[PDB]
Design an enzyme around this catalytic site. Structure first.
Site, mmCIF file in Angstrom:
data_model
loop_
_atom_site.group_PDB
_atom_site.id
_atom_site.type_symbol
_atom_site.label_atom_id
_atom_site.label_comp_id
_atom_site.label_asym_id
_atom_site.label_seq_id
_atom_site.Cartn_x
_atom_site.Cartn_y
_atom_site.Cartn_z
ATOM 1 N N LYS A 1 -57.650 57.386 -29.938
ATOM 2 C CA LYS A 1 -57.954 57.279 -28.515
ATOM 3 C C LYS A 1 -58.764 58.470 -28.011
ATOM 4 O O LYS A 1 -59.823 58.293 -27.399
ATOM 5 C CB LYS A 1 -56.656 57.137 -27.718
ATOM 6 C CG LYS A 1 -56.837 57.239 -26.215
ATOM 7 C CD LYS A 1 -57.497 55.984 -25.671
ATOM 8 C CE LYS A 1 -56.600 55.276 -24.672
ATOM 9 N NZ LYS A 1 -56.753 53.798 -24.757
ATOM 10 N N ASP B 1 -58.503 45.823 -24.714
ATOM 11 C CA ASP B 1 -57.975 44.686 -23.977
ATOM 12 C C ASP B 1 -59.029 43.618 -23.748
ATOM 13 O O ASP B 1 -58.689 42.437 -23.680
ATOM 14 C CB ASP B 1 -57.389 45.155 -22.652
ATOM 15 C CG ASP B 1 -56.673 46.485 -22.770
ATOM 16 O OD1 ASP B 1 -56.025 46.723 -23.812
ATOM 17 O OD2 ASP B 1 -56.754 47.288 -21.817
ATOM 18 N N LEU C 1 -58.936 47.997 -17.190
ATOM 19 C CA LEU C 1 -58.439 47.795 -18.542
ATOM 20 C C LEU C 1 -59.225 48.658 -19.527
ATOM 21 O O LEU C 1 -60.242 49.266 -19.187
ATOM 22 C CB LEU C 1 -58.517 46.313 -18.919
ATOM 23 C CG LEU C 1 -57.234 45.480 -18.888
ATOM 24 C CD1 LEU C 1 -56.462 45.656 -17.591
ATOM 25 C CD2 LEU C 1 -57.594 44.018 -19.079
ATOM 26 N N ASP C 2 -58.739 48.705 -20.764
ATOM 27 C CA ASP C 2 -59.286 49.583 -21.786
ATOM 28 C C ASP C 2 -60.215 48.809 -22.722
ATOM 29 O O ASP C 2 -60.531 47.636 -22.494
ATOM 30 C CB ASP C 2 -58.150 50.263 -22.554
ATOM 31 C CG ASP C 2 -58.428 51.725 -22.826
ATOM 32 O OD1 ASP C 2 -59.495 52.031 -23.396
ATOM 33 O OD2 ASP C 2 -57.579 52.569 -22.468
ATOM 34 N N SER C 3 -60.659 49.487 -23.782
ATOM 35 C CA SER C 3 -61.617 48.906 -24.716
ATOM 36 C C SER C 3 -60.973 47.893 -25.653
ATOM 37 O O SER C 3 -61.660 46.993 -26.147
ATOM 38 C CB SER C 3 -62.295 50.017 -25.522
ATOM 39 O OG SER C 3 -62.545 51.145 -24.700
#
Ligand SMILES: CCCCCCCCCCC[C@H](O)CC(=O)SCCNC(=O)CCNC(=O)[C@H](O)C(C)(C)COP(=O)(O)O
Lengths: 125, 149, 88, 70, 178, 155, 64, 114
Positions: E51, C46, C42-44
């Site tokens: 991003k 989430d 998962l990402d930052s």
């Protein structure tokens, strides 16, 4: 934008000095964390020592109490600005409320001695 | 021009010279210079200009081979930041009466690079124009300040 | 109050019940001992969105200095248990 | 322990979150907590109420005014 | 709370702090959950520019622009929790929170009113007095002699010993007592 | 404590400024004292004038109501800036537009109540008629003295 | 006591629901009973006498 | 309305309520009978009415309070005397509105004669 105030200060997240920082400022923050870590480890060691039965003698609170109580007159220097502002703040409203009290009582004594002011039901003076 | 940058932007980072003063040259050691190299020579603040004679795919292959992974991430996440510098309208006048020719500059704060009006302030500045005493146009020159001068 | 006290298995079932309702979580892949960065990928955003899920799930506030560090369901269960101070 | 409901009973359809998710997918994104927040719009809670049904509650039994006081 | 703040907040920490303040001041504003989920995925349609920003000067400039947008469009009364500071019940139950040194000053009638718990507290105090002389020696050898010292305390490196600085964490009163 | 760790005088030299910084457990470069105006402050370090609401709430503090640490230098105005007293927390809207909004509301409402005092908004009606020479027997007066005859007629 | 349910309706008791329903029913019964017995909230008196259509001889004629 | 008219219209033809009646009552009328008080001073004083309530229509207020005292505790059955006293207060209000409109028509007569 959001204008700063002395009573409604700029927050550190909206502060422009948090976004253009230098490695000497970051070294200052690391040294501030280091001195907070040293003071927190000393306080926590004195907190969790079971040989301690008394309180925590807080040296900075003793310093603040001593500075607010018994350092002000040893650190007095007589300046003309302090002398004039202290003379105004210690003399001025005494002459002002002297003029208010003497004007109101001269008015009351003049109206009593001339008969214009009537004490109709005034038994307990 | 250095006196004008000193007196136009006083108290700001634009007051200082590009060369630096003589009391600041003598204390510049190696670690301050490599701190400056590690801070302000970062890769996305750097462009690679070529002009003619090149091919762009050849330049991007050579930049992948050589000028890739210079430095991207800062030391303690301490980013440099540009500030809006104060323009202070002021006067500095270095009086040297034995010196032969007086150099005097007068400047107003203009909008700068990213504001789109550098073309119209430049076309006013180019109507006003320039003159040197070796120009052979004479009285019949188009700029009326040079014609009056 | 009239709210019941919270068991460890009930807290684990509640945390897994919110965590299987996220869209990018495979529930067969999801175990209690799986890391959000390198074991479910998962990402930052989430991780802190899992933190907002615990915010509007359990009705209390997790600070962001703990919420950056929390990265897996087992110590988010143990952190919520150690904040609500349950004996098992 | 507590008998939790199963996660398969919270679908997206029949909710205003379905309308939000299909408008948001016409934009070109997806909603990650749309199955999670569907308990507020799916199940017994499905069906919005009206101002007769909150303020005029019990009016059909409160229309028992009697003319028989003779 | 249980962990420690750093010397400096990083760019990722400040960006996730802006994401947390944005996603609570949204649902402070957009009250219904349909509007909260539509505006939260609009906030994801706003994160997608941040991003792959690579300069980090432009990322801090976008951080300043988003922070100025957050302070311009923030709620005057934000969403607060019963357990959060500035809240409904921030340290409301401090009538319970009387710590474990005050049980030493109980009368022996009240100590005989609770027989087994005071014997087990005597066992916990024996664990304190037999653990502290190795706990305070552990910190003076795991203390680094260099000029940087962190806030986080070391764990129990020796097997069979307790972690250092354990009592003030382990004997806080419960946050929801009754 | 002793006289050395107790406060005294003003830092005139940088070595005694560094000595006062290690007295107060603060950084040497951050040690900005109060200016020497003879006000009795002396070598006390001037912190920025932010109240204890503006510090970090979720971090566990040594002095929990003060939100201070042990050995951290207590502000000279800490009793001024305690959590019961005046907050210097950042408001959502700025101070000058806040003061303009509140004083504009107060001045506009005072001027509008002066406008409502100027036009006193009367119903189309006469005064309330009171009988028997307008109740002069019942208002309080001498019954031997004849009252002033006012007469309220029919229409 | 309640067995508090998760993400669903609580089992609402007949005492609570007929208690609230009969309380609101008694309130609208009181509103309709008093509104039938005296409609003076909207009526008041018969009418206010508007001074535009007052005849001058019962008003008192001004002379000339 | 009257309040609508006297702000930003003429205040000469429109009366001010503090000087009512501005004219003497002899003009316009050949004679006026006085409002003869049905309730006298001794009955009103023994009935102990408040000086705000001692109007020209306290004759039904005394009957209202007598029927309320003799019909305690059936306070619902004392609405007819409240209706009669409110009708007499409505007649006092129509006499007050009649002297208001007679004052405004007499000021119209004053501005027509001037
Ligand atoms: C109606 C209300 C209006 C007002 C509402 C509030 C208005 C303001 C809203 C502000 C919202 C905020 O901007 C959200 C955003 O952009 S979030 C972006 C997060 N995306 C990343 O961080 C990229 C992924 N991260 C990584 O790949 C690693 O972390 C990395 C390698 C970079 C670490 O590098 P280093 O550091 O180790």
């Amino acid at each position: 934008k959001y204008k700063p105030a002395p009573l409604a200060t700029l927050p550190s997240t909206l502060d422009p000095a948090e976004y253009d920082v230098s490695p000497e400022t970051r070294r200052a923050q690391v040294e501030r964390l280091s001195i907070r870590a040293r003071l927190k480890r000393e306080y926590l060691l004195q907190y969790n020592d079971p040989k301690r039965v008394s309180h925590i003698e807080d040296p900075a609170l003793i310093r603040w109490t001593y500075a607010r109580s018994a350092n002000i007159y040893p650190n007095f220097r007589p300046t003309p600005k302090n002398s004039l502002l202290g003379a105004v703040a210690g003399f001025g409203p005494l002459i002002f409320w002297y003029y208010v009290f003497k004007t109101d009582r001269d008015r009351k004594e003049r109206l009593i001695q001339e008969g214009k002011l009537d004490r109709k039901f005034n038994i307990s003076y | 021009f250095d006196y004008l940058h000193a007196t136009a932007f006083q108290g700001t980072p634009l007051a200082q010279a590009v060369e630096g003063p003589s009391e600041n040259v003598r204390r510049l050691s190696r670690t301050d210079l490599t701190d400056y190299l590690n801070r302000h020579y970062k890769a996305p603040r750097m462009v690679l200009a070529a002009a003619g004679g090149v091919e762009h795919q050849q330049l991007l292959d050579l930049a992948q081979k050589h000028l890739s992974s210079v430095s991207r991430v800062y030391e303690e996440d301490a980013v440099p930041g540009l500030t809006p510098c104060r323009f202070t309208g002021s006067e500095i006048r270095h009086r040297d009466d034995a010196l032969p020719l007086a150099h005097v500059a007068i400047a107003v704060e203009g909008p700068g690079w990213a504001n789109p009006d550098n073309v119209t302030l430049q076309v006013a500045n180019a109507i006003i124009g320039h003159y040197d005493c070796t120009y052979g146009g004479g009285v019949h020159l188009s700029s009326p300040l040079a014609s009056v001068a | 109050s009239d709210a019941p006290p919270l068991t460890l298995d009930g807290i684990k079932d509640r945390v897994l019940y919110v965590l299987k309702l996220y869209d990018k979580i495979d529930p067969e892949k999801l175990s209690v001992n799986s890391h959000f960065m390198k074991d479910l990928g998962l990402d930052s955003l989430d991780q802190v969105e899992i933190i907002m899920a615990m915010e509007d799930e359990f009705g209390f506030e997790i600070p962001d200095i703990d919420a950056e560090k929390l990265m897996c369901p087992q110590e988010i269960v143990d952190y919520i248990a150690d904040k609500k101070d349950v004996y098992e | 322990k507590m008998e939790l409901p199963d996660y398969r009973q919270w679908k997206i359809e029949g909710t205003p979150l379905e309308t939000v998710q299909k408008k948001l997918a016409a934009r070109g994104l997806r909603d990650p907590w749309a199955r999670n927040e569907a308990w507020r719009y799916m199940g017994g809670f499905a069906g919005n109420i009206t101002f007769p049904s909150v303020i005029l509650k019990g009016f059909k039994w409160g229309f028992a005014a009697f003319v028989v006081a003779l | 709370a249980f962990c420690a703040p750093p010397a400096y907040l990083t760019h990722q920490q400040k960006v996730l702090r802006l994401y947390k303040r944005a996603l609570r001041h949204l649902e402070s504003w957009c009250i219904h959950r349909d509007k909260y989920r539509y505006f939260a995925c609009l906030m994801r349609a706003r994160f997608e520019e941040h991003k792959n920003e690579k300069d980090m000067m432009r990322a801090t400039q976008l951080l300043r622009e988003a922070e100025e947008e957050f302070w311009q469009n923030q709620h005057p009364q934000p969403y607060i929790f019963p357990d959060s500071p500035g809240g409904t019940s921030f340290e409301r139950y401090e009538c319970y929170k009387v710590p474990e040194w005050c049980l030493d000053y109980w009368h022996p009638s009240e100590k005989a009113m609770y027989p087994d718990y005071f014997s087990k507290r005597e066992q916990w105090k024996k664990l304190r007095m037999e653990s502290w002389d190795r706990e305070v020696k552990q910190l003076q050898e795991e203390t680094s002699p260099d000029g940087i010292m962190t806030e986080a305390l070391p764990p129990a490196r020796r097997e069979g010993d307790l972690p250092p600085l354990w009592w003030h964490i382990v004997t806080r009163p419960r946050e929801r007592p009754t | 404590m002793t006289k050395d760790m107790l406060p005294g005088s003003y830092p005139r030299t940088p070595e005694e400024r560094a000595a006062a910084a290690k007295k107060y457990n603060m950084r040497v470069e951050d040690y900005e004292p109060y200016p020497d105006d003879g006000m009795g402050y002396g070598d006390y370090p001037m912190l920025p004038n932010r109240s204890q609401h503006e510090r970090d709430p979720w971090y566990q503090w040594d002095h929990s109501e003060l939100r201070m640490n042990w050995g951290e230098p207590i502000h000279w105005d800490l009793d001024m800036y305690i959590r019961n007293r005046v907050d210097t927390s950042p408001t959502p809207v700025s101070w000058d537009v806040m003061c303009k909004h509140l004083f504009g509301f107060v001045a506009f409402m005072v001027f509008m109540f002066w406008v409502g005092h100027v036009f006193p908004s009367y119903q189309p009606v006469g005064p309330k008629q009171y009988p028997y020479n307008n109740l002069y027997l019942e208002r309080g007066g001498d019954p031997t003295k004849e009252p002033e005859p006012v007469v309220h007629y029919d229409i | 006591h309640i067995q508090p349910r998760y993400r669903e309706f609580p089992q609402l008791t007949r005492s609570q629901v007929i208690q609230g329903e009969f309380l609101s029913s008694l309130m609208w019964f009181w509103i309709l009973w008093r509104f039938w017995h005296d409609s003076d909230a909207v009526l008041g008196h018969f009418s206010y006498p508007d001074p535009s259509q007052w005849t001058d001889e019962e008003l008192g004629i001004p002379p000339d | 309305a009257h309040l609508t008219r006297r702000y930003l219209w003429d205040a000469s033809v429109e009366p001010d309520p503090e000087k009512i009646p501005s004219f003497p009552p002899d003009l316009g009328f050949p004679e006026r009978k006085e409002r003869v008080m049905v309730a006298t001073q001794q009955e009103m004083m023994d009935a102990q009415l408040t000086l705000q309530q001692r109007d020209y229509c306290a004759h039904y207020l005394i009957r209202l309070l007598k029927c309320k005292r003799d019909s305690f505790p059936n306070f619902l059955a004392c609405k007819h005397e409240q209706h009669d006293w409110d009708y007499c207060e409505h007649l006092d209000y129509v006499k007050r509105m009649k002297e208001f409109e007679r004052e405004r028509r007499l000021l119209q007569r004053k501005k027509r004669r001037a």
